[PDB]
Design a protein around this ligand. Structure first.
Ligand SMILES: Cc1ncc(COP(=O)(O)O)c(/C=N/[C@H](C)c2ccccc2)c1O
Ligand SMILES: Cc1ncc(COP(=O)(O)O)c(/C=N/[C@H](C)c2ccccc2)c1O
Ligand SMILES: Cc1ncc(COP(=O)(O)O)c(/C=N/[C@H](C)c2ccccc2)c1O
Ligand SMILES: Cc1ncc(COP(=O)(O)O)c(/C=N/[C@H](C)c2ccccc2)c1O
Lengths: 468, 473, 471, 468
């Protein structure tokens, strides 16, 4: 028995708010979950096409994973990273030998507890390996929230600052942490189109975004730039780059003697219909960061995978870094089971298939809806650009530079979400003009149809314009 | 089943060698130490060796290893969840905050609201962000030898040289590599350790007003940089990794000084929290209340990853007025929250804080006797299940390792008294030692038995005999 | 009956032994002694005369050793002496009155001046005031900007070869930036105005007509938050960085900063005081900044002086507070006497109009040279400040690939502008550039036509040699 | 003939204020100067026992210096540092061979225009030579105002920020430049004593301030620390260290492999009754910075002098640093003449002997004035600790951590100055409770008598309470 009224009371009173003021806050109790559904205390079932934070890849409450965690609990317990366990050794083995067995770059893994911790770790390693301070990120990148990971996060609305309630006159950024000179922000891969939608390139055929990034590094001195960090599809920032961007980044970094870190926290583990996002582009990074789909959120886990050469350098020294819960044996038991089910049940192929299906459904919805400017993606990770049906331009001018000071009733993705909710579906986005769609890798055709139907409905209401 | 070997530990050790990044050891020197299972205060190796753990891992398995009520409660949560992020409400998350504020701290007026995260470093990151936003000021004051975590923001307030995630050599003190760029934009002042400013006797020095000199110098730094730009002073009441106990007056004088200067006080309870010192929280020994505390470790007794920040009513009311653009995927994870609830309920139900207090008294008497028989014991101090023992050369009464708490792990461990002690004690099946070269850091579960305390103190006696025999040099 | 006896060989020996080197290693260094100067000429101790078409550092605007300025300095020395900024003198108040009332009397923005000793000091001052006025930390500069060498001014300098680091001798292997230089720097590097051009030379614009350089600048400010950006700092023509912007860039920057609520600092240390054929470089663009910085032509290097001029609204804000800033030599009365005399001579003899007229002359001279020499890819400028783009005559592309991102680790014998300089020297003319593919030409504002002909002649000769390829 | 009423109008209207609001500002015109006097337009003569900013060492408007400047002006003109001149070369030879000919450490000079520029240069050189980022300064040190020099200035009231008019309700530090992570502030040399005023030494005899400084360097890693920067007597900060502090800093820096930069901008060129302040302590630095007394403020000049080994390192590279007016030949002529007159007329011994006279005058004043807690100094650089006689403690509690937001009618050194001005004497200090006394090195005994007489008068008034 649960007194859910008392839960709501304690939630309001004793928990710090995020994204909502206390004044506007309404708690949203979830009593249990299963597959692609959340279940409220009263039995209301919600089809979650956010997959929480694109991070419950295997599906909610997988029985094999939960069984594996219970088995681990018969033995552990807790030991820290200095001690060896079967679960932690095996989890690293599955990643390097089984998932990445066909690639030569993978060297060694360090496990930590969250994606931000994985990014912090990758930044530290890249800087130690190169003995260089600067890291290049991109406009709209999101790489986590802790002090080091936030420095390479250039998504204005997600930098742990304060904004007002339906007022944009109240921006407060964290003092002493609102900019960092050890990071250079390169432009979005998406910023160099001409008025016809064609890509701008230099005389050598290099995308202008890449060429600009190259010039920034030359100007600061390649001898002081450790790495470029990317997302192959910007997650929170909600954008897909030109196909040639990632290959050209790989090339450019090799030529300049600079490491490439690809952040796979969100794109990893089948999200994009391949094992990793980078594998769509025929190149291999120096370092990747992992979270989310690593355990499909069953328990907190993050990881960094470094190349053979980076691993060999680190092996030669005593590294003075300790994180209490890094390698936690029960979280590692969850990771092993998560990955074993993903492999065994061919979840990556499932995602590719469901993605091809989703593309079809979006082709149909676009023909039917003028507020869809474009859509793109793969697997269970899609963007849909929303535009004013009349003007063919976005409703919110600041777009990906907006802040949460805005009134949600003026935000197209907030409007869409609220309408789709009437149909028992959670679907929308985090950017004002852009849908961010994702479900479990094994989402059913039936649930995809249900989601797309609710979206059809929300888009009718949006294009009616009676919300304005 | 006909299966008689679930795990191939030989295979595990090869994977561990090959595929896992090393910490504190080079690959060349590394020797894996596999642990197949744990229970109470014991670690069990796959060959059956049982080790009595008087490190309690990292002073963090407060309830004891593999508590059956906690593990049962985790299994029950797995019937319902699943995963939801912080935007959604659950019974476990809400109850965990309620237990902390209403139940454990029900006799105190300052507590306002909790944010749950996944680790102690994430809790410190959160506390720094909130202190800076609340005051609208950039600077944070820390102390020499403080350890507050390893992530970029938490590391800025960590001033323990050997724990800042840099690289050192294999038995060579001449190859330090710090992380390039790690202080680009750090807004932190290092104030002195409470413990510096000592007599020849050992008195901690005060001015004419009776203000400790460590506190007076901290006041002067904040004045100099301008109190209007200092968001907070962050402390540990007993430095954990740094291995130090302050003079009794230090923490009360810090509270008074911060109030007078209009500066926040963050006390980091990640290690001292949840009965570790024989009160619920370390700050409670000192008759003062902080503005913010950070938590981890004993918050869940490491059963699953959890960290938390608790801010005052004042601070919570301020944050409540704004939309806070901060998201952490696993913050408030419902299964981790289930573990925190059960951990705290057991801790309350069974009076673990009183158990720790009593065992600490019993440890004090054991340590008094060891001191009477070993001149290598300079002094000792502590409470509950958290103890320091200063080790000295019995002949000179000066520490063996001159750099002391400013050492690095580039040193050869065969020269480090706490490594010597530890290696010897292991012959008795006991893990006991410390992280600083001249200072033991001793801790066990809050419910450790008298028999295990005796066993660990016996092992220590034996190790000290060996250290004092000088044969190791 | 008294000789000013100087042992010049001893001078050279002391110079080698006792003075720190810049730009040259000790081993490759050869001292070049200058005994006196006059107009546009440097005189060596043996009497050799060198026509200086660098005007040293584009900074001796009035001409070398102007008799009127030097007499006015001698006159001030009858009274001073030294007093610091807390005390008032005629020379210091008059210098400020001349700038505000007599030179910029046709504009309404000017409020108050603070005098300092150098252009880097003036830039340090401008950064401090902009940040204090807006109560905001970030300043936006551009790729290849040069704003000075001191700690604050260097943060907004993004010219790689001029950031007081170390490079090797004819090796790009060993090189060192100053450790710890960026700990705390609150600076964003925006694109240079020239960054987005097509193969015809047209600078690219978005739909409504905004230059892409400006558009990305605005996007960076939006992303970091306009509420924390104090200012954008510019040069209207990049000095050391050797570049001219498209006409619309500066008006667009003025427009964008007004729209975003951000200050515009224009750095006039090099382009100021007649250098571009108008009193100040920004005056070619029909806009007015919030703050400018001054040096060089401010005193025509007669004595060290720099200055910052701030708008009326900024001045009114500063006036309401006690500002805790002291510089020992700020306002030095004898330096202020030099500034007053330099500016009075400049106004009374119409040096600005002379500069405009001579620029039109130089323009005509460079057209002829470009017709005769294919290694001239393009040229641009005004008054006595010219860039000439030097290219391979056959490809019409630059020889040195790193271009404005080069370092002084390069061998000078591979640098086109070094080659041109070396050749022109045979003719007793100093002319060339600081960037590898780009001439940077300047003389005194009152330079004579005959001297212009003589410099252009030397360049004719140099370019012949460049275009034979023998080097 | 000058219209001083109009000068005063232009000064009010067109010049930026420092230390005063426009509201409270009263211009103080000075028409000419000579020796130790400033002469107002109406002929009023003021005896200047601040020597402006402790910087007109030779005396005001020395005729031999002024004649040398006029001669230079018959030749120059301007040439930058790439060209050699007799004045610039000779200035360098005068410093290294003539003034410092008895010492082995001096290598090479770089001339710049100001003391802050000199400090900026030294910071850059120390960091380049060691290839390390951190520089240790001390609480209350003043090393200049420009961006790099300000990072090592830890004198609160002199960091170019804003304060209010007789109030605390406004106050603003320069955003983005109010603290720096590349500097560590070590304690002031008089850190703590015991109640009796005994110095605290450890078992190795090391003063607590030095031992603490040592621990900071160990903590941050000696391999990361380029230099310790000092003033042998804090100039603006107004303090004299224990005799043994400086020797022990020299020893500690040598042991740790760290450079020692001593800032001689104020203590340099006879100010302390020796050629340089450091020379009272029997040790030699690695780098010194110079200004003020370098030209006795006749024209703007500063300089850095680096050791032979630092000079040999720098000589091996191409240094990409330019400062337009560095080495200005007319400023260099002034420097030459200044140093020649000092040498030829034994200004250093004049300073030493006058300091001994000042000492006996202050001794007599202290017998008669219980508001004098203590005094110390040498040459023409003195501090006097002012206290409330009836409490034996300073009147202004924040002391050297005060700000200029305070009312000057509550500041003892302001009271003293205002009163002393009735006798045509300028004397006082810049810290609230501490006089800072200096005149030209060739100041006459008659002028010392006249200044000390006016101080005696000022202290009668202070002690009377009538100001309160
Ligand atoms: C590419 C990437 N890297 C690192 C992290 C940081 O991982 P964490 O949270 O510390 O475990 C994240 C998390 N993003 C958040 C939760 C998100 C995702 C989508 C929309 C809005 C927000 C990420 O996407
Ligand atoms: C006061 C304090 N705060 C924060 C953290 C950071 O917590 P985390 O690891 O991110 O969950 C810790 C952890 N310390 C480490 C693991 C330690 C303890 C003793 C000896 C050596 C190392 C801590 O002691
Ligand atoms: C736009 C600008 N701002 C500030 C300063 C800094 O003034 P300063 O030197 O401190 O008096 C300068 C100086 N430039 C140097 C001397 C230069 C010029 C041309 C080529 C190479 C270098 C400048 O051009
Ligand atoms: C030790 C020292 N170093 C560097 C400088 C910086 O020299 P500058 O001004 O850039 O030529 C100074 C200047 N001090 C100021 C002007 C002062 C002195 C006494 C009281 C109050 C203020 C200094 O004392």
């Amino acid at each position: 028995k649960i007194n859910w009224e008392q839960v709501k009371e304690w939630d309001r009173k004793y928990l710090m708010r995020t994204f909502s003021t206390q004044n506007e806050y309404q708690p949203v109790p979830i009593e249990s979950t299963e597959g692609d559904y959340l279940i409220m205390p009263d039995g209301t079932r919600l089809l979650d096409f956010f997959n929480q934070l694109y991070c419950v890849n295997l599906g909610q409450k997988n029985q094999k994973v939960n069984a594996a965690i219970k088995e681990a609990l018969d033995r552990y317990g807790f030991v820290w990273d200095t001690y060896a366990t079967d679960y932690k050794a095996k989890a690293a083995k599955i990643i390097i030998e089984d998932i990445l067995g066909d690639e030569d770059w993978p060297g060694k893994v360090r496990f930590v507890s969250t994606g931000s911790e994985a990014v912090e770790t990758a930044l530290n390693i890249a800087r130690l390996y190169t003995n260089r301070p600067l890291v290049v990120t991109r406009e709209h990148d999101y790489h986590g929230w802790t002090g080091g990971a936030a420095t390479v996060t250039r998504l204005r609305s997600y930098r742990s600052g304060l904004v007002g309630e339906n007022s944009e006159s109240f921006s407060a950024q964290i003092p002493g942490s609102s900019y960092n000179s050890a990071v250079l922000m390169a432009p979005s891969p998406n910023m160099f189109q001409d008025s016809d939608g064609n890509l701008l390139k230099d005389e050598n055929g290099e995308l202008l975004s890449v060429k600009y990034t190259r010039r920034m590094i030359e100007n600061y001195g390649p001898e002081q730039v450790a790495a470029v960090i990317t997302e192959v599809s910007q997650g929170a920032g909600s954008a897909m780059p030109p196909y040639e961007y990632i290959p050209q980044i790989r090339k450019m970094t090799k030529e300049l003697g600079v490491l490439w870190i690809n952040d796979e926290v969100l794109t990893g583990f089948g999200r994009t219909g391949k094992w990793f996002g980078y594998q769509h582009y025929g190149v291999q990074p120096d370092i990747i960061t992992m979270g989310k789909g690593l355990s499909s959120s069953s328990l907190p886990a993050g990881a960094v995978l470094v190349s053979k050469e980076i691993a060999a350098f680190m092996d030669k020294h005593r590294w003075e870094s300790v994180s209490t819960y890094a390698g936690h044996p029960v979280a590692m038991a969850a990771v092993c089971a998560n990955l074993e089910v993903m492999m065994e049940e061919n979840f990556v192929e499932q995602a590719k298939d469901s993605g091809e299906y989703i593309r079809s459904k979006l082709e149909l919805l676009q023909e039917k809806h003028k507020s869809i400017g474009n859509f793109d993606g793969y697997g269970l990770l899609w963007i849909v650009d929303i535009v004013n049906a009349k003007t063919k331009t976005p409703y919110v001018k600041l777009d990906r530079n907006f802040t949460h000071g805005m009134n949600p009733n003026q935000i197209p993705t907030q409007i869409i979400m609220k309408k789709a909710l009437e149909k028992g579906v959670l679907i929308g986005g985090v950017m004002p003009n852009t849908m961010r769609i994702g479900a479990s890798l094994n989402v059913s055709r039936g649930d995809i149809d249900k989601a797309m139907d609710a979206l059809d409905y929300a888009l009718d209401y949006l294009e009616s314009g009676e919300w304005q």
